């Protein structure tokens, strides 16, 4: 319940889908399909991808911590502990996946990884595509001073002071 990267939203949604409560007075478990549970687990897996890659990104980014005294060392140990905890989470997701569909836990994180990668790509692409409009307006305002090339041969009558 305590994680290095905040409360696990996706995990909580998964486990809440499992332990559904009375929707109303009726005290009937509103039956949630296995397809939904599977989808939720896959979401959880994607989040886990982001988290583990974040931690391991830290480790390379934050290496010189080992050369910054006992405090940097303690922080590095923190990172290691975080990684191990997250690995435990990944294992749990794997065997949960196998329990849902036998053998699924062998590829669920391959699919999850690809999903994450695709998301990130889409985002970067989207800021690039977003810049284009204002780049156009800037270009239009800039090009106002540039001489027209169609039959540029003929030129403006030069100023002769008389």
């Amino acid at each position: 319940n305590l994680y290095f990267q905040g409360s696990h939203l996706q995990r909580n949604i998964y486990l809440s889908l499992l332990h559904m409560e009375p929707e109303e007075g009726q005290e009937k478990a509103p039956k949630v399909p296995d397809s939904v549970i599977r989808a939720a687990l896959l979401r959880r897996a994607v989040e886990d991808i982001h988290r583990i890659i974040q931690i391991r990104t830290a480790k390379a980014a934050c290496s010189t911590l080992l050369q910054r005294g006992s405090v940097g060392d303690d922080l590095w140990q923190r990172f290691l502990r975080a990684e191990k905890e997250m690995e435990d989470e990944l294992r749990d997701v794997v065997m949960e996946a196998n329990a849902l569909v036998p053998g699924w836990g062998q590829i669920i994180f391959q699919s999850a990884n690809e999903i994450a990668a695709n998301k990130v790509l889409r985002d970067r692409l989207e800021e690039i595509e977003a810049q284009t409009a204002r780049d156009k307006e800037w270009w239009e305002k800039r090009r106002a001073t540039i001489k027209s090339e169609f039959m540029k041969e003929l030129d403006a009558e030069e100023a002769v002071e008389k």
């Binding site: 319940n1 409360s7 996706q10 949604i13 809440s16 939904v36 999850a112």
Partner: protein
């Protein structure tokens, strides 16, 4: 138990997951919950409508159904054919269709494939754009091309470079091409371009002083 419970609602038939009224107590947390649930439902629909096999989970990514790739190839060469015939706008519509179909590949399928296909299509459409002199959009597409494939894609770097110098952003072009030479595709076209850029930079403000 060992987690933070969230009250949820289920729509039968719709199969959709709804958030309880103020489930978490915080506007931020609640909005995050709503967006995540949106992604969840969307994923459910995706799994329901895009898994052709009998097993209702995504197949491993590495063996990939080559149909989509083939179609993308067809529209790509369609665009190229419309390009050689020097009617560029149509080639652009075709390239655009290619990008759309490439970017709508299921998310659990290899992202690197997507990167390949969209890199080439982005570069092509970029060139087609800078044939029509529409520089900003061309620079955009070329930038997307480089974003998809940074190395072994010197043509994209070149194209955005020339787009940048055409719309008088000479310093940006200088640095862009300069860094584009560090990642290595073929060099000397980028080298020619760079020599033109910094020669033009010297000549530009030798006249300022």
């Amino acid at each position: 138990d060992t987690f933070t419970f969230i009250p949820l609602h289920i729509d039968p038939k719709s199969k959709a997951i709804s958030a309880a009224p103020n489930a978490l107590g915080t506007p931020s947390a609640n909005k995050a919950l709503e967006t995540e649930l949106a992604a969840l439902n969307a994923l459910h629909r995706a799994l329901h409508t895009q898994i052709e096999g009998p097993i209702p989970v995504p197949p491993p990514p590495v063996p990939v159904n080559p149909k989509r790739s083939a179609n993308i190839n067809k529209l790509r060469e369609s665009g190229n054919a419309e390009y050689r015939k020097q009617r560029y706008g149509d080639a652009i519509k075709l390239y655009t269709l290619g990008l759309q179909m490439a970017l709508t590949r299921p998310a659990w399928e290899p992202a690197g494939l997507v990167r390949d296909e969209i890199h080439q299509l982005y570069s092509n459409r970029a060139q087609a754009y800078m044939q029509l002199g529409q520089w900003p959009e061309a620079a955009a597409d070329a930038e997307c091309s480089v974003e998809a494939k940074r190395q072994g894609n010197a043509k994209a770097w070149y194209r955005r470079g020339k787009c940048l110098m055409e719309m008088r952003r000479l310093q940006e072009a200088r640095e862009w091409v300069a860094r584009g030479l560090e990642f290595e595709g073929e060099e000397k076209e980028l080298a020619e371009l760079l020599k033109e850029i910094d020669s033009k930079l010297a000549a530009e403000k030798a006249s300022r002083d």
